[PDB]
C-alpha cells in the first residue's frame, strides 16, 4: 500500500502567514499513463472534505490562487499564502494512482498564540453519584496553550492509570486556547478506601507540575 | 455541479450487514468518465478509500476489504449503493459518497462530496445519561454526563443565557456507553447566590435533565 | 495494480 506521510501533523500559524505542508509517498505516484494523481483536500470543522488541488498543481475551480501545489515523484508540497480563518481545518494529501487509493494522516492548520498555563479545577464525586455506588473524580484543565499537555492521577500518592478518561476540546474560537477534561472513575467502595485524590498537570509553561488535590473526608 | 447525499442505518450490531445508499443529482452517472467512490472516516480521524464504481459498471475495491464490500448502482433511481458484510466496531465511521470522474472528464479527482452519514457499530441499548453536578475571582463549575447511548447529547447552561466561559468536551466511549462533561466559569460572587443550571438533552431517549449545581 | 483512469 502506498504510504502517504504528511509533515507536520499540526501547523500553528498567525493570520496572514504562509503555511506549508509536505507530503512524501512510499513510492512514485506517477501512473503508467504519465499522469501523477496527487490531490489535496481540506476538511473544515463540521464539514466534509472538499477538493483543493488535483494532479499535483491544478487548482480546482473556485479555489483562490493563494493555494498552490507542487512536487513530483514522491515529494509534494501544498503551500497556503495569506492564511485566513476560513482556511483553518485539516489538510490531506491523497494518491489516486495505485490501488488501494490512500490518504495522508491529515495536517491540522491552527492558530498561534502566546503561551498560557492551564487553569486547573478538581471535583470530588457528587453525593448523587455516590448514592448509585460509583465515584468519578473530575479534573478540568482549561484555556492553556500550546495544546500539548500531560495529566497524572495519584490516589494516596499512588499513580493510577485504569479508570481514567480524557477528552480535549478543539482550539477555542474566541481566545485560541485549548482545554482538557480528565475523569477518574472508581466504585464507591474503592473511593472510600482512600483519602487523597490528586491530578497533576505538566505543561511547557512551568517546570513545576500544577497540582490540584482534595481529601475525601472534607 | 453535483450534489450527493448519503443515508444509512445510523446504528447496527457487529456481524450484521451495513447497507449505505447515496442519492446524487446534477450529473448522470451513466455519462462517459463519471464514477463514484465511497470514503470513510474511522472514529473522528483519517480518511480511508473503500471502493469505486465507474459509469460502465466496472468496479474497484480496497483489496483488504474486497471480501466484505459490494458497490452497485441504479441510475434509474439516481442512487449508488455500498454494502458491507459482517461489520465490527472498527467499521464505526462517517461514510461519504463522492463523485470522482476520470477521462474524458477533465477533472479527475474527488470533486463533489456528500455531507456524509454517521455509522455506529454497537450492541448497546438506548440509555439516558446520568447527570452529576460538579461543585468546588472566577469560580469553575461543571456537569458530568455519564452512561448514555447513542450520541449525541447537547449541553447548555442557564438555558443558553450563560454562553461565555463554557467548555463542553467531546464524548468518549466508556464501557459501551458514552460519557462527556462540560465546565463553566462565572464570577465568584454570583455563585451560589445566583443559580447555575446545566441543561442536558438526549434526543434519542427523549429526555432532558436540568441539573442545578448546588454547594458541597 | 493501478487505478483505472481511462
**Domain assignment of residue B216, yes or no:** no
Q: Do both B197 and B148 map to the same domain?
A: yes
Domain ends where: B72, B96, B123? Answer: B123
Q: Which residue has the cell 513530483?
A: A72
Task: Print the domain residue range for B109.
Answer: 1-123
Number of domains in chain B: 2
Tell me the C-alpha distance between A165 and B145, whole Å. 13
What is the 3 state secondary structure string of chain A? CCCEEEECCEEEECCCCCEEEEEEECCCCECCCCCECEEEEEECCCCCCEEEEECCCEECCCCCCCEEEEEECCEEEEEECCCCHHHCEEEEEEECCECCCEECCCEEEEECCCCECCEEEEECCCHHHHHCCEEEEEEEEEEEECCCCEEEEEECCEEECCCEEEEECCCCCCCCCEEEEEEEEEEHHHHCCCCEEEEEEECCCCCCCEEEEEECCC
Q: Which of residues 81-140 of A touch B (CB under 8 A)?
A: 92, 94, 96, 99-103, 105-106, 119, 121, 123, 125-129, 132, 136, 138, 140
Nearest to A200 by CA among A190, A208, A210, A192: A210
Question: How close, in Å, is residue A33 to chain C by CA atoms?
Answer: 8
| Every domain of chain A and the residues it spans | 1-113, 115-214
Q: Do both B26 and B62 map to the same domain?
A: yes
Annotated ligand binding at C5? The verdict is yes
- For A155-179, letters b (16+ CB in 10 Å) and e give beeeebeebbbebebebbeeebbbb
Inspect the interface and report whether the beta carbons of C5 and B102 lie closer than 8 Å: yes
Q: Do both B26 and B66 map to the same domain?
A: yes
Q: What was the resolution (in A) of this experimentally determined structure?
A: 2.2
Residue in C1, C3, C5 closest to B103 by CB: C5
Q: Do both B30 and B93 map to the same domain?
A: yes
Q: Would you call the peptide bond into C3 cis, given omega within 30 degrees of 0 as the criterion?
A: no
- List the grid coordinates of B143: 456537569
Inspect the interface and report whether the beta carbons of C6 and B54 lie closer than 8 Å: no
Inspect the interface and report whether the beta carbons of A126 and B136 lie closer than 8 Å: no
Reduced to 3 states (helix: H, G, I; strand: E, B; else coil), residue B204 is: helix
Class of domain A115-214: mainly beta
Domain ends where: B123, B157, B189? Answer: B123
A1-113 shares its CATH topology with A115-214: yes
Q: Do both B70 and B96 map to the same domain?
A: yes
The burial of B90, by beta-carbon neighbours within 10 Å (0-12 exposed, 13-18 middle, 19 or more buried), is given as exposed
Across the beta sheet with B18-25, what order do the strands follow? B3-7, B18-25, B79-84, B69-74
Tell me the C-alpha distance between B81 and B73, whole Å. 6
Question: 10 Å Cβ neighbour count for A217?
Answer: 7
Q: Do both B140 and B52 map to the same domain?
A: no
Q: Give, in order, the Cα–Cα distances in Å from B61 to each of B48, B50, B54, B94.
A: 12, 6, 12, 18
The burial of B164, by beta-carbon neighbours within 10 Å (0-12 exposed, 13-18 middle, 19 or more buried), is given as exposed
Which of B188-195's residues contact partners 24+ apart within 8 Å by CB, and which partners?
B188/B137, B188/B138, B188/B139, B191/B139, B191/B141, B195/B158
**Domain assignment of residue B86, yes or no:** yes
Beta bridge partners of A17: none
Q: Do both B147 and B118 map to the same domain?
A: no
Q: For strands B112-113 and B79-84, give the pairing.
A: unpaired
Q: What angle do CA A212, A213, A218 make, to 5 degrees?
A: 140
Reduced to 3 states (helix: H, G, I; strand: E, B; else coil), residue B190 is: helix
Experimental method: X-ray
Inspect the interface and report whether the beta carbons of A35 and C5 lie closer than 8 Å: yes
How many Cα atoms within 13 Å fall on the side-chain side of residue B158? Answer: 14
Q: Do both B49 and B6 map to the same domain?
A: yes
Tell me the C-alpha distance between B87 and A81, whole Å. 43
Across the beta sheet with A178-187, what order do the strands follow? A119-123, A134-144, A178-187, A164-168
Question: How close, in Å, is residue A140 to chain B by CA atoms?
Answer: 8
Q: Do both B13 and B117 map to the same domain?
A: yes
Q: Which residues of C touch A1 (CB under 8 A)?
A: none
Domain ends where: B104, B123, B142? Answer: B123
According to CATH, the topology of domain A1-113 is Immunoglobulin-like (2.60.40)
**Domain assignment of residue B215, yes or no:** no
Q: For strands A107-111 and A10-13, give the pairing.
A: parallel
Minimum Cα–Cα distance from A95: chain C residue? C3
Nearest to B100 by CA among A101, A56, C2, A91: A101
CATH number of the structural domain spanning residue B31: 2.60.40.10
Q: Do both B129 and B194 map to the same domain?
A: yes
Q: Which of residues 1-6 of C touch A (CB under 8 A)?
A: 1-3, 5-6
Q: Which residues of B touch C3 (CB under 8 A)?
A: 52, 60
Amino acid at each position: 500500500d502506498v504510504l502517504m506521510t504528511q509533515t507536520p501533523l499540526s501547523l500553528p500559524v498567525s493570520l496572514g502567514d504562509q503555511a506549508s505542508i509536505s507530503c512524501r509517498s512510499s513510492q512514485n505516484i506517477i501512473h503508467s499513463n504519465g499522469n501523477t494523481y496527487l490531490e489535496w483536500y481540506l476538511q473544515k470543522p463540521g464539514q466534509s472534505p472538499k477538493l483543493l488541488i488535483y494532479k499535483v498543481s491544478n487548482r480546482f475551480s473556485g479555489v483562490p490562487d493563494r493555494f498552490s501545489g507542487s512536487g513530483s515523484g514522491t515529494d509534494f508540497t501544498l503551500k497556503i499564502k495569506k492564511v485566513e480563518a476560513e482556511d483553518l481545518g485539516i489538510y490531506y494529501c491523497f494518491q489516486g494512482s495505485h490501488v488501494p487509493l490512500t490518504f495522508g494522516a491529515g495536517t491540522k492548520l491552527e492558530l498561534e498564540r502566546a503561551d498560557a498555563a492551564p487553569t486547573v479545577s478538581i471535583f470530588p464525586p457528587s453525593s448523587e453519584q455516590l448514592t448509585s455506588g460509583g465515584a468519578s473524580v473530575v479534573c478540568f484543565l482549561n484555556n492553556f496553550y500550546p495544546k500539548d499537555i500531560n495529566v497524572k492521577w495519584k490516589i494516596d500518592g499512588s499513580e493510577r492509570q485504569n479508570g481514567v478518561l480524557n477528552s480535549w476540546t478543539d482550539q477555542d474560537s474566541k481566545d485560541s486556547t485549548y482545554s482538557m477534561s480528565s475523569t477518574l472513575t472508581l466504585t464507591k467502595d474503592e473511593y472510600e478506601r482512600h483519602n487523597s485524590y490528586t491530578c497533576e498537570a505538566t505543561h511547557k509553561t512551568s517546570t513545576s507540575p500544577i497540582v490540584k488535590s482534595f481529601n475525601r473526608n472534607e | 455541479q453535483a450534489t450527493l447525499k448519503e443515508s444509512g442505518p445510523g446504528i447496527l450490531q457487529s456481524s450484521q450487514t451495513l447497507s449505505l445508499t447515496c442519492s446524487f443529482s446534477g450529473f448522470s452517472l451513466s455519462t462517459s468518465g463519471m464514477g463514484v467512490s465511497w470514503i470513510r472516516q474511522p472514529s473522528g480521524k483519517g480518511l480511508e478509500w473503500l471502493a469505486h464504481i465507474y459509469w460502465d459498471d466496472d468496479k474497484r475495491y480496497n483489496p483488504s476489504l474486497k471480501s466484505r464490500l459490494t458497490i452497485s448502482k441504479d441510475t434509474s433511481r439516481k442512487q449508488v449503493f455500498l454494502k458491507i458484510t459482517s461489520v465490527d466496531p472498527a467499521d464505526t465511521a462517517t461514510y461519504y459518497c463522492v463523485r470522482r470522474p476520470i477521462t474524458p472528464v477533465l477533472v479527475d479527482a474527488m470533486d463533489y462530496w456528500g455531507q456524509g452519514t454517521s455509522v455506529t457499530v454497537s450492541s448497546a441499548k438506548t440509555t439516558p445519561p446520568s447527570v452529576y453536578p460538579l461543585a468546588p475571582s472566577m469560580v469553575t463549575l461543571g456537569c458530568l454526563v455519564k452512561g448514555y447511548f447513542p450520541e449525541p447529547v447537547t449541553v447548555t447552561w442557564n438555558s443558553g443565557s450563560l454562553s461565555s466561559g463554557v467548555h463542553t468536551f467531546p464524548a468518549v466511549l466508556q464501557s459501551d456507553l458514552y460519557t462527556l462533561s462540560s465546565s463553566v466559569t462565572v464570577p465568584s460572587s454570583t455563585w451560589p447566590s445566583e443559580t447555575v443550571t446545566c441543561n442536558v438533552a438526549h434526543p434519542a431517549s427523549s429526555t432532558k435533565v436540568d441539573k442545578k449545581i448546588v454547594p458541597r | 495494480a493501478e487505478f483505472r483512469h481511462d
